[PDB]
Structure 1
């Protein structure tokens, strides 16, 4: 019993009593676990015993304890965890594992990168952001072994600890695995009564956009324990909060005699996956009730389809039908999985082709910034293994494993392909399978695997002459094969025809767009660039929370809500419209930019379903089918 330990425990009791949010969070975890246990008893999921703690609240309550948490976490985190366990045990007596702690908030000088991690930060709580490059196999670690002695018919047990389990060092007492009892009787291992805690080690390298352009990168190992396991995949941007620890003896013992130094790693307490641009982490936003009410009150309006569309990229003049197509693609339709395993597409593919300087790349860059899981690729820059997958070899097991390409990484997401015309044919015929079957089949030497590639694709192409020609055949203008043309749901030809009034209006719009100042910025000061890393949970300038046209942060709240919540179902009144329009398009005498197949019918169904998603309707209506039908007519005529 240590007196300063008890004093720190009592101080964290006072902090937990003052801030009732953590008191409510412990109770909310406990009622969820007890309700699931009662459901399993009567007729699932379990929540881990750890609490998110704000460092700013602790700093306001007690600056000494906050600086103790940051600077000497070994002396301050175990008292606080003991205090949290005491609180949870005092409340859970009426309805066993000790409670853990996680940390959020500003870290100040402790917000570092793997390059910025130095030996002065050892034995300190640090928050480190980077990219996950390597992850190890999840391995169980024996904590208590249970054994049976058949001669006496009794169960024995032995507890095992290692240096990574405790923040404070302890005298290492290595107790061997018992095969005798104290009297010499044979022991048999009771697998299933023993306890094994999951253990992982990941490598966090500094982000390639925050790393210097010529230097070799710096990384650090992070050890994760039971409930922090498998919260990451390789390629994720992460923020790991944990204690920068030194372990063992750096060769000072006689047996060791070498200059690896003291081995250093982060004992992770907290792992936040971060959303960065063109990464595999999907952007998510926490929806408050007020935002849900705003989304629902916009849903009842009649002009909601012409309000969200024009508010996508208001800094681009024209392309009004393309904005509608991008919105319906972001809604993304409903995927059908039949009882015999046959799959039907839900997502919408858009090809744009036409004259240069027509804001195609700007639209691609907008979709890269406004979509939750958009990944940007270029034509010749990416390759066949670049988009689909590749096979490499890991160091430990020596067996071949898979590296996921851009299409696999953008599963349930968005692929923005610029310079679609300049792509190699091998990667084309790779893309044929992805855009329809929505899967990637790898048949390499020894490995045969099917990966999910459920993706929306936006493509920007150019005509073979550099400029679109009205008098020439559009098949001659695009010069793309028929099978790729059929995959894309909507194909838009954007010609830079020039008229005096239109050039006047575009010139005024661009000139008034270049005269924008951000709020809080001086007239002469340059706008600074801060890279956007968002936490993933689970032409008028003054648009402020749905006055006329919505903000981009609110618009992706609407898209997220419509994607998770409503799953519209097709009905007869939409079916008649889409059947009539499909028959008319199949038997039209007019020449079309896009060929007409049975794929256009499913395009009509997906577009009607996507428009129903905009209205937050559980049913697809006639008005959805007609707008989906005459949106297709613009892309064809």
Structure 2
């Protein structure tokens, strides 16, 4: 009956006030926040008692129950009244697990009853619903009662229930072996862990791998009973922004996507898309769109696809899509039959999952127009209306669209106007904020530096790799860039009278010039949407400075950008 000594070990481990008192402090915090689970770091346990630590990982169940009882006794010794508020306490684990860190592919039947640490990408969820643990019945005519664990009438207030949910984890597709589809596993979430993860999240789950029963065919289904769930995704920024020696926005734009050479204005516009504008609301109930949309058109081999694959790696909550490989149902939402409950419910599509994020559409000119009808409502209003599976609803799909396409006839024709080369409808072309045209002008002076840069890139080898190796199948630093952009997304700067005056006067001047100009010399007409674009771009530039005001410099930069985009051949 050594488990009574094992519980005794855990209780004297938890009583660490004699040695710097970290865990007693954590338990005190748990009490103050009215909580009922604790998170223990396995490194500390391994340091204090090697035998107990190395036994815990290979006997998850029999050891964790002893640990839970030790915690219950310790909190009761601190405060019995608090200990009586909850039926039982729980403990979760963190740290380094060594050999027990696995994936949904490498996890096999020999891991049963070990503590395991699985990681992958979440693909689906069931709905939260209650489960019974103890039921009670009472008789008022006799003052009598009975109980059961898992005449008289049921006592819902003396009975007690707890929450239950199921989710599914999938292997990272980048790590799949050659020529095979990804594998997956089912995770069970219970009590205070429900709804801590949603589809598209990258998670790392700690739990115990276990069979479920099922005459018998001698065959079982295996599930991971979760024990903890984890997610993954100042002075430096202060002194850097305080310098004011140079236009910081130009330096950040120059440093964007170092592999790709040229295309200055495109990089500046993409940085404005990453920073975004700001929303505003009016007393009549109307509101102004804060997010930005961008379109790219051009010849073969001008790095259009690579810029999309870069933004997708350097922005939070970003999604890919290709014109030929996707459907309107897949873009918005699809009805699904739940196998846990049997019920019919909706499942999110690509543009819904990109809410408060970015969505990249490659090969945009190959979509059927019926899909573009779905994209129209999303890009204009940020909402999507659905009328299926007994639900009439207005879902949230607020996102910035970055899209790329190739011109009609494959190679752009100099002897035709922009509206002739571009294959899209004039209604749709009016929705994007900025439209860029890119061309492979075969100048030898430019080919010299381009070819040199490409060849420099192909001779590199990483410092952690040796002279002849080959990989298996399966300027500002990037880290600072991410942190600076992340802080800059809070500032919410405001207009100034001078910037407003400048924008108004300059817009009137631009309108007069456009009135003089002809469709043979412009991509699209200029209207109030131009003012909205100018305001968004000036706001974003002020945001990059972290200046609380929108200044004349921001407005001047914004108008120069749109001037280049609209009034160059």
Alpha-carbon displacement from aligned partner over 1:109-155 (angstroms, at most 9, x marks no partner): 3222334333321111111223444432211123344555434668x
The CA RMSD measured in Å over matched residues stands at: 3.0
8 Å Cα contact 2:277-2:540 kept in structure 1: yes
Match of 1:123 in 2: 113
Cα 1:215–1:416 change in 2 (3 A) is closer
Change (3 A) 1:333 1:195: farther
> Partners in 2 of 1:296 and 1:91 — Cα distance?
44
Kept after mapping to 2: 8 A contact 1:135/1:202: yes
Aligned position for 1:625: 555
SS of the residue aligned with 1:487? coil
- Aligned pairs (5 A) from 1:343-492: 343-395=287-339, 397-444=341-388, 446-492=390-436
TM-score normalised by the chain length of structure 2: 0.88
| Counterpart-to-counterpart distance in 2, 1:148 and 1:572 | 73
Instruction: Tell me how far apart the structure 2 counterparts of residues 82 and 560 of structure 1 sit (CA, whole Å).
Output: 43
Where do 1:237-276 residues align within 5 Å? 237-247=202-212, 257-259=215-217, 261-274=219-232
Q: 2:76, 2:82 within 8 Å by CA — same for their partners in 1?
A: no
After superposition, residues 18-29 of structure 1 pair within 5 angstroms as: 22-29=23-30
Q: Distance in 2 between matches of 1:61 and 1:126?
A: 22
Contact 2:277 2:536 in 1 (8 A): yes
Deviation of 1:454 (Å): 0.7
Tell me how far apart the structure 2 counterparts of residues 524 and 585 of structure 1 sit (CA, whole Å): 59
Structure 2: 5+ residue runs without aligned partners? none
Say which SS state the counterpart of residue 449 (structure 2) adopts.
helix
- Which segment drifts farther, 350-359 or 263-272? 263-272
The question of whether the paired residues in 1 share the 8 Å contact of 2:193 and 2:228 is answered with yes
Q: C-alpha separation between the residues in 2 aligned to 1:605 and 1:557?
A: 25
Question: Is contact 2:11-2:71 (8 Å) kept?
Answer: no
Q: How does 1:5-16 map to 2 (within 5 A)?
A: 5-10=6-11, 12-13=13-14
- Deviation for aligned residue 1:341: 4.6
Shift in alpha-carbon separation, 1:85–1:446, aligned structure 2, 3 A: closer
Matched, 1:101 2:27: no
Q: Displacement, 1:246?
A: 3.7
Relative to structure 1, is the Cα distance of residues 188 and 604 closer, same or farther in structure 2, using a 3 angstrom cutoff? Answer: same
For the pair 1:140 / 2:84, whether they are aligned, the reply is no
The residue aligned with 1:175 is none
Unaligned runs of 5+ in 1: 35-47, 162-179, 181-185, 251-256, 275-282, 284-291, 531-548
**2:345 aligned counterpart, secondary structure:** strand
Give me the whole-angstrom Cα distance separating, in 2, the residues matched to 1:26 and 1:629.
58
In the superposition, relative to structure 1, how do residues 17 and 361 fare at CA in structure 2: closer, same or farther (>3 Å)? farther
Distance 1:217 1:305 in 2: 41
Q: What is the aligned counterpart of 2:149 among 147, 155, 160? A: 160
Q: 2:464 aligns to what?
A: 520
Shift of 1:377: 0.8
**Alpha carbons of structure 1 residues 260 and 350: separation in structure 2 relative to 1, 3 Å:** farther
Give 1:220's aligned residue. Answer: 185
Matched, 1:316 2:260: yes
SS at match of 2:324: coil
Aligned pairs, how many? Answer: 556
Structure 1 residue corresponding to 2:240, chosen from 283, 298, 311 = 298
**Distance in 2 between the 1:17 and 1:347 partners?**
56
CA apart distance, 1:19 = 7.5
In structure 2, what is the equivalent of residue 73 of structure 1? 60
Any idea what the Cα deviations from partners look like across 1:468-508, whole Å, max 9, x if unmatched? 34442111122322222221111111122233332222222
Higher relative contact order (CA 8 A, sep 6+): 1
Cα shift readout 1:583-603 (whole Å, capped 9, x = no counterpart)? 333332343224323222111
